[PDB]
Amino acid sequence: AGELEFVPLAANDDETVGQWLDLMALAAETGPRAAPPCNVDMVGSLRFAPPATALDDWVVRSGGRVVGALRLALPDGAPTARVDQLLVHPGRRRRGIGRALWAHARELARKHDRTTLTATVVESLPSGPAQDPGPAAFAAAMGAHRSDIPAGTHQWLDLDRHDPLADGVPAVPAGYSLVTWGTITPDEYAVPVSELELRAAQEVRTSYARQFETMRVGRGRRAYHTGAVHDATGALAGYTSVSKTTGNPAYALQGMTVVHREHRGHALGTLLKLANLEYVLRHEPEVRLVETANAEDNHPMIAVNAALGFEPYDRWVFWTAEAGPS
Numbered sequence: 001a002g003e004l005e006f007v008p009l010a011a012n013d014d015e016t017v018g019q020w021l022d023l024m025a026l027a028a029e030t031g032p033r034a035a036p037p038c039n040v041d042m043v044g045s046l047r048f049a050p051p052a053t054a055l056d057d058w059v060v061r062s063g064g065r066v067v068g069a070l071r072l073a074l075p076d077g078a079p080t081a082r083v084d085q086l087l088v089h090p091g092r093r094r095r096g097i098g099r100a101l102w103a104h105a106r107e108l109a110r111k112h113d114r115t116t117l118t119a120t121v122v123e124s125l126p127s128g129p130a131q132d133p134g135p136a137a138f139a140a141a142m143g144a145h146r147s148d149i150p151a152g153t154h155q156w157l158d159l160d161r162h163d164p165l166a167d168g169v170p171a172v173p174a175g176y177s178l179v180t181w182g183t184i185t186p187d188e189y190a191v192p193v194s195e196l197e198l199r200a201a202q203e204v205r206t207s208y209a210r211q212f213e214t215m216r217v218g219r220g221r222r223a224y225h226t227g228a229v230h231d232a233t234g235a236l237a238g239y240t241s242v243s244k245t246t247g248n249p250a251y252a253l254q255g256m257t258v259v260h261r262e263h264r265g266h267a268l269g270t271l272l273k274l275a276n277l278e279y280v281l282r283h284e285p286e287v288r289l290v291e292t293a294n295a296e297d298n299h300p301m302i303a304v305n306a307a308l309g310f311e312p313y314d315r316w317v318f319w320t321a322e323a324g325p326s
């Protein structure tokens with residue numbers, strides 16, 4: 001744009017945070033279908049990072065005003081730096097600001113000893129509404145490439161178009177019972193939840209990370225859980241969650257539904273999503289629009305989401321780039 005100033009984005013800097021919040025609100029008017037940014041969520045996203053991860057947040061100023069933002073997430077101990085945000089004011093695009101942000105990105109990755117920069121790019125579905133080809137044309141132009149892994153299929157359910165609960169919730173299969181819980185997971189279900197990511201000399205462990213819950217709460221996010229228990233063995237046969245921001249009463253996020261491998265074949269995923277949705281709507285009556293995302297190779301949950309009225313809208317494509325030389 002001319003002289004660009006890079007200044008860190010710190011949450012105590014009300015003037016700079018305010019501008020960043022505004023940049024986002026304005027870019028979201030013309031970006032991908034999305035819930036508007038919730039300021040509580042966003043500002044807490046500067047203070048409360050996900051587990052074992054550092055943040056390195058920046059804005060870029062032109063003539064003293066923010067005209068873009070770059071956010072990196074650095075997983076502790078990993079050779080990667082993830083671009084959680086690279087955004088240029090809709091009024092100042094095609095002027096080299098994104099390029100400059102990306103160059104600053106590679107420099108920050110390098111300062112943090114990261115070899116690789118990774119990114120999620122919004123693209124079109126073969127089926128779906130044609131999407132802005134800018135991001136992908138930008139990412140190619142910065143020298144990134146698409147990773148050879150399953151992209152995400154990002155889906156929407158609009159309850160004003162289709163009511164999945166019009167025929168109530170299906171019966172719980174014999175041998176099972178439904179349990180529900182709010183934002184914090186009872187101790188009882190924490191380890192069982194973590195073992196649902198499913199010899200003997202090993203080295204790595206899975207565990208429930210309370211910091212996820214605390215990050216959420218700090219971001220003003222509320223959550224809703226339904227679990228299925230297998231009575232004879234007490235294993236947690238399945239579970240699922242919705243996440244809801246302070247802002248945007250009409251929007252909600254459906255998270256993963258996972259069914260334990262020894263409990264497939266009983267329609268737990270359908271029962272779980274419908275019971276959990278009902279549980280959301282009776283606490284969040286104004287919820288109308290629900291989003292979710294599956295890896296495009298997860299056919300089973302895709303088949304479940306579709307039966308429920310979820311419609312694939314856009315594609316979440318993983319890209320990667322070299323950080324170096326210098």
Ligand SMILES: CC(=O)SCCNC(=O)CCNC(=O)[C@H](O)C(C)(C)COP(=O)(O)OP(=O)(O)OC[C@H]1O[C@@H](n2cnc3c(N)ncnc32)[C@H](O)[C@@H]1OP(=O)(O)O
Nearest residue numbers: 086087088093094095096097098099119134135137138141
């Ligand atoms: C890996 C990633 O960060 S993907 C980027 C994700 N960011 C977003 O989707 C946020 C919303 N969108 C944006 O903020 C802008 O659309 C983004 C990121 C390009 C920002 O970029 P800008 O400041 O406009 O672009 P900048 O001027 O540095 O980039 C230009 C290069 O990328 C390409 N490019 C950028 N935008 C487009 C576009 N909309 N259509 C086609 N090509 C494009 C061109 O090669 C362009 O170079 P130029 O025409 O000389 O040839």
